[PDB]
Each structure stands twice: as structure tokens, then as C-alpha cells.
């Protein structure tokens, strides 16, 4: 019966490939008030911290959400530095804080499956490609599709939040729709998943041509 | 923090094959109180109503969820009669009402794609099968896996609730893990989707072998 806030961990693609990790500390269901909410950051070593971008905007059902994103060093995160997001709101009696850091659990390499559908009736112009990532731990993972060595927009391919497998690990399914002109330009489509457990370079990829 | 309740629609598998479609009216976020909640049912035509089985249960997050399941005749639903669930709660000033009926939107037949995973080290006996159901309307759908004409339990296969594709229709992914002895018993496994748009008998299926 109280306001809560959630904190997220940086995605592996922003960590290893982009090399710019995104840390998000967000607050939710805040009853709108003239009180200003102050979000501060610190790290466990008590040594200097990079400034955080602050973005506050209202939401559709009327509850307020304020978010602050802090850029982090890649090695600072892999070494395990623990980060502290402090939220203070006059509505709350005492300050609220949330902490996060690297997970030390068992690591499982991601298994990548790239599948293409045969040309079936009624959709000559649009084709569908599916990707299945299986048996990876921890739950942090980022998946992407590259067409002609280019980063396709996030909107283009629909992905699924990780769910625990029936056996061991988690599995993620993603669906991509290719236009006729896309495979008309180039026929190689490779699905690659970035994950902390993954190696050599935290990348696992599989490609198969539209026709086997 | 007002309390709300939802009513659900019958699944196509319970509708077309089982011949017993059940509509469930349930309440959630119930603030626990000694006041007992009463749920009644009616149909729009004022025609007979079968008694609804009522089950009330607590949940992990402490909120009470109370459900009432009413069996409906398949013909009554295909005709399109709209059913009304009336919920009355001593805390609420006036009763609450929820209504449901058949969908009349455009209907698209489901496309089924069955995929098999290559044999990976450390799990020689157990393999993974994937199914993609695509371009179907409306978002009513139920999926099943048949192994040598046997229904594997719903729990065995992890499925995804339908979400709207970038274009027109919805897509559903389902993941199943096969035992060694099962494909030793029979090697063709059939992914079947039950949907209103599907025909002749509201079933669309494609099969995949575990390995060639």
C-alpha cells in the first residue's frame, strides 16, 4: 500500500557492442504532487560518479513516473561495482534507496536458432524469420537482427521477454518481417544474441539463407 | 485504489472440440474484508442460465481473487447471445456489471510453422521444438501439441499470449521439449492451432520430425 520504484540493469548490447551501458532507475504510481522528487546516485567505492540524465513525464492512466539514466563504465560494471539510486519524495517519511550490481550466479552460453519459413501461399511480398535463444543464464540478454551489416531499428523485430525453460535456462523468441526488397537486396540474415555468459566476445550468432 | 474485476471469453479449443465453452467472471485486488462477494449471471435474451461453479482463493501477493465459471452451450455462443456477469460486493455502493459476446471482426486463418532444434552437446536425448502461429484474427486462439495422436498436458509446452503484429494479425510462439523415449516411440510431432477462422473444422496443423 505504498509507492514503489524499480531499477534495471544495463543490457549486454549496450555493454559489449555499443560500449555505453544504460542504467535506468524509475519510480511509478506516484500520486502527482507539487513536491519535487530528487534522484541521486552513488557507487560503493564512494569515489566520483558520472552525471545522470533526468527525464520526468506523466503517464496515461494519470500516475506519475520519473526516470533517471546514468552512464556507467563498462569495466566498472563487469568488475561488480554496486550502484545506488536514491529517491526522496516529501510524501515518503524516510528516504528510499535501491541498489544493483553484477550477478554472480552460474552462466550458461546462449544457444542460437535461426529459422526461415518456406514460401507459403498469400504472402509473396512479406516473409517471416524466427529466432530462438535457449539455455542462457542469467536472464540478461539482448537480441538483434542485422540485414546487410546494418543495425535494424528496435521496432522492426518483435521480441519476447525471457521466460524460464521447462528444463535449464531461459528462452527468447523473436519474429522479424522482411519485405521483398530486403531479401531482393541481400539474402543473408543473421540472428545474433549478446549475453554476459556468451563468448568469445559475448556474441552468439547463427545465419541461414532464406532457402536451405 | 478502487477494486476491479475482469470477465474472460471461451477458448477455441474448449469451444470447437471439447464442446464445452466456459466463461469466467472473476474479481481481483479484493481488499480482504469479512464481507462475502456474490456473483450472479444472466444472458441477454432472458433465456435459461446454467449454474456457475464458484471458487474463491487467496494469492501470493495477499489479494483475494474470486472466480465464477459458467458453462455455455456452443450453439448459444455461435448465435452471438451476450452474457452478463453481475458482481455485488458489500463495500461497493452499487453493483458492478461485465458483459461479453462473440467477436464479429474480420477473421484470418492461422499459419502454423513447426521448427526443430539441432542436437546440442550435453542433451543428446532431449530436443526442443518450436511453433509459430501467424496472421490470425481475431486474437482468440488455443494451441496444442500432439505426439502420436496424444494430447500432452498444457503445462508441458510453454506458450505466449497473442500480441498484435506490426501489420495485420497476431503471432504466438510455443516451445516444447521432447523426451528421448517419446520420439523413440513415435517421431512425427504435430503442432495444432484451434481458432475460429481456421477451417474446415477450426484446426490448422503442421508436423515436424525430431531429426531426419
Amino acid at each position, epitope marked *: *500500500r*505504498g*509507492v*514503489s520504484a524499480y531499477l534495471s540493469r544495463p543490457s549486454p548490447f549496450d555493454l559489449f557492442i555499443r560500449k555505453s551501458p544504460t542504467i535506468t532507475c524509475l519510480v511509478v504510481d506516484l500520486a502527482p504532487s507539487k513536491g519535487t522528487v530528487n534522484l541521486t546516485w*552513488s*557507487r*560503493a567505492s*564512494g569515489k566520483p560518479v558520472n552525471h545522470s540524465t533526468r527525464k520526468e513525464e506523466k503517464q496515461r492512466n494519470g500516475t506519475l513516473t520519473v526516470t533517471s539514466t546514468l552512464p556507467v563504465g563498462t569495466r566498472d560494471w563487469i568488475e*561488480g561495482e*554496486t550502484y*545506488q539510486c*536514491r529517491v526522496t519524495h516529501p510524501h*515518503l*517519511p*524516510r*528516504a*528510499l*534507496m535501491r*541498489s544493483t*550490481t553484477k550477478t554472480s550466479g552460474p552462466r550458461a552460453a546462449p544457444e542460437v536458432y535461426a529459422f526461415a519459413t518456406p514460401e507459403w501461399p498469400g504472402s509473396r511480398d512479406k516473409r517471416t524469420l524466427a529466432c530462438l535463444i535457449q539455455n542462457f543464464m542469467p536472464e540478461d540478454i539482448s537480441v538483434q537482427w542485422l540485414h546487410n551489416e546494418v543495425q535494424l531499428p528496435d521496432a522492426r523485430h518483435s521480441t519476447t521477454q525471457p521466460r524460464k525453460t521447462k528444463g535449464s535456462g531461459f528462452f527468447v523468441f523473436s519474429r522479424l518481417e522482411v519485405t521483398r526488397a530486403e531479401w531482393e537486396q541481400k539474402d543473408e540474415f543473421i540472428c545474433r544474441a549478446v549475453h554476459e555468459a556468451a563468448s568469445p566476445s559475448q556474441t552468439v550468432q547463427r545465419a541461414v539463407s532464406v532457402n536451405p | 485504489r478502487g477494486v476491479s474485476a475482469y470477465l474472460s471469453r471461451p477458448s477455441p479449443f474448449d469451444l470447437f472440440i471439447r464442446k464445452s465453452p466456459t466463461i469466467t467472471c472473476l474479481v481481483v485486488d479484493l481488499a*480482504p474484508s469479512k464481507g462475502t462477494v456474490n456473483l450472479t449471471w444472466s444472458r441477454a435474451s432472458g433465456k435459461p442460465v446454467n449454474h456457475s461453479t464458484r471458487k474463491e482463493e*487467496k494469492q*501470493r*501477493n*495477499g489479494t483475494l481473487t474470486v472466480t465464477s465459471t459458467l458453462p455455455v452451450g456452443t450453439r448459444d455462443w455461435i448465435e452471438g447471445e451476450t452474457y452478463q456477469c453481475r458482481v455485488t460486493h458489500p463495500h461497493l455502493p452499487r453493483a458492478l456489471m461485465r458483459s461479453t459476446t462473440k467477436t464479429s471482426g474480420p477473421r484470418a486463418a492461422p499459419e502454423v510453422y513447426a521448427f526443430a532444434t539441432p542436437e546440442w552437446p550435453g542433451s543428446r536425448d532431449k530436443r526442443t521444438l518450436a511453433c509459430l502461429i501467424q496472421n490470425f484474427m481475431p486474437e482468440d486462439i488455443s494451441v496444442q501439441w500432439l505426439h502420436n495422436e496424444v494430447q500432452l498436458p498444457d503445462a508441458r509446452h510453454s506458450t505466449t499470449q497473442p500480441r498484435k503484429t506490426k501489420g495485420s494479425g497476431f503471432f504466438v510462439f510455443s516451445r516444447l521439449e521432447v523426451t528421448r523415449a517419446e520420439w523413440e516411440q513415435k517421431d512425427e510431432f504435430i503442432c495444432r492451432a484451434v481458432h475460429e477462422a481456421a477451417s474446415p473444422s477450426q484446426t490448422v496443423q503442421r508436423a515436424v520430425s525430431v531429426n531426419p
Partner: single-chain antibody
Amino acid sequence: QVQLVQSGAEVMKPGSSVKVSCKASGYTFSWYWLEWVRQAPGHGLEWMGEIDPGTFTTNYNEKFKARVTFTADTSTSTAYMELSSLRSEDTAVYYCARFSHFSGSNYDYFDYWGQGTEIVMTQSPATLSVSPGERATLSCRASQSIGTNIHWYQQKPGQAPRLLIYYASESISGIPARFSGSGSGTEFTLTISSLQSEDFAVYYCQQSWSWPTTFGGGTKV
């Protein structure tokens, strides 16, 4: 990567000054409230006090207010507790606590290396020794209805109480799924699906609803 070092045990006789130091590593010493809890052999854990090093403000229990003294040191990230009016009647082990929290009052994350030579609940059943393979349920009921603001701690003999369940419903990571908690209002139940000699310890009830914070008598297995 967050451990806290309490001070080495020291000799005492009635009427002598005592100082014990709690050191903080792995988190910013200034931002989190520190707390002091007292466990006396044969008595459930009782609230001793708390201190904020960021503002140097201090809070005290009803009975220990005048006896106890609280201070902290920001530069080295160390905080120590001092006490007077010592009696052997006040023989107990004092576990130093941190205050990780959501809103006003909450569970604690702390280590325990300090030994010195009121809206309370009912702890039940009092004690039960090892019995393998049978589901074990521990019951905690508080004098004033607590809603769901309750916590479960596990102290293996000689170590720090380790937080098991927060808010009685959901378990902290790393804990096996066999431990489960449920309840509402005044009543709460902790259920172990299967009991194994691997995890044997005392389990203490926690109430943050009102001041001072209270702990159950405990149940050892």
C-alpha cells in the same frame, strides 16, 4: 560485495564503559541508516536503536535511550556504539544492522560480529528440533494488526541473521523455492515444503508497522 565488520569481543564487568565499532564496506556509509539490535541468550531479539550518519541524527529505544550512546565517522566509513550502566543482567550479543528500505520502515541487511560479555508479537511454536522430510510451519501473530509489513530472518548458530522473506510473501534471491511465506492481517505462516538438515537455524519474526520495531521469540530447528 557488501559486508560489515563489527568490533572484536572485549572483557566486561558491571559498571565499565563499552565501545563497539561497526564498519561498512560495499555501500555508501552516509546514505543508509545504521541500526543496533540486542539479542540476549534466552530472549528474542529486541530493538536497541538506530543512527543516520548522513545527518548525524540519532534515535533510541525507550529503555536504552539513556544507557546507550550512538555516533558515526564519515571519513573512514566506520560507525561505533558506546554504552554505559553495564550490568551482567544486560549480558547479550549485539548485532549491528543496516536499513535498506522501501518507504518508512523495512527489513535489514547486516552482518554480526559484536558480542558483549512494546508492540511485540507471539512466536509459535516455540521450538522444534530436526525432523526430516516433513513440512514445517512456523506461526507468528502480532498484538496489533500488521497488514503485510513483516519480515523473516534466519540466523545460523554463530553467524548473522540472514534475511529470508521480505513482507512475508516473496523471498530474497538465492533462497531455495521450498521456503514460502503467506498471511494477512495479524496472522502469518512460513511454510517449508520439505525440511532438510542442510538448513538449520533460528527463525525470527520482524514487525516494522510501528515503533519500536519488534522481533518474535524465534523458532530453532
